[PDB]
Amino acid sequence: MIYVTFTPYGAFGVKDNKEVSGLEDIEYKKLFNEEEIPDIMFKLKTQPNKIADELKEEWGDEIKLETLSTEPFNIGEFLRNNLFKVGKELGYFNNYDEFRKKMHYWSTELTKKVIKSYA
Numbered sequence: 494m495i496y497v498t499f500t501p502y503g504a505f506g507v508k509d510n511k512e513v514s515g516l517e518d519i520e521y522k523k524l525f526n527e528e529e530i531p532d533i534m535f536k537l538k539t540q541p542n543k544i545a546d547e548l549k550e551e552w553g554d555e556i557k558l559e560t561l562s563t564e565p566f567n568i569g570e571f572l573r574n575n576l577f578k579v580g581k582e583l584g585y586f587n588n589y590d591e592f593r594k595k596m597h598y599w600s601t602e603l604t605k606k607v608i609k610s611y612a
């Protein structure tokens with residue numbers, strides 16, 4: 494059973510909700526290229542079960558998404574508290590100003606898609 498959290502820049506999984514200190518403790522990593530980030534934020538938001546079946550195929554195990562759980566996962570707490578630092582380590586953000594500007598753009602693009610979804 495793989496427990497998965499998504500950030501804007503990736504999907505990250507660990508078997509059996511194990512504790513996570515660092516990226517070395519993360520067993521499954523799918524990184525997203527920046528041009529698809531908002532599209533994938535919107536698909537997570539509107540068809541999470543489809544996202545889950547896709548990961549089940551790609552990673553080879555049943556999948557629990559954190560967005561479909563009432564209790565946060567160890568992996569989710571780690572990524573939320575280290576969202577900038579892990580994204581810098583992965584090459585998405587060179588500094589905090591960039592992180593801020595990128596997160597803003599992605600969120601704005603996601604909103605645009607959500608507004609459109611409402612006719």
Ligand code: NA
Pocket residue numbers: 512513514515518
């Ligand atoms: Na560890």
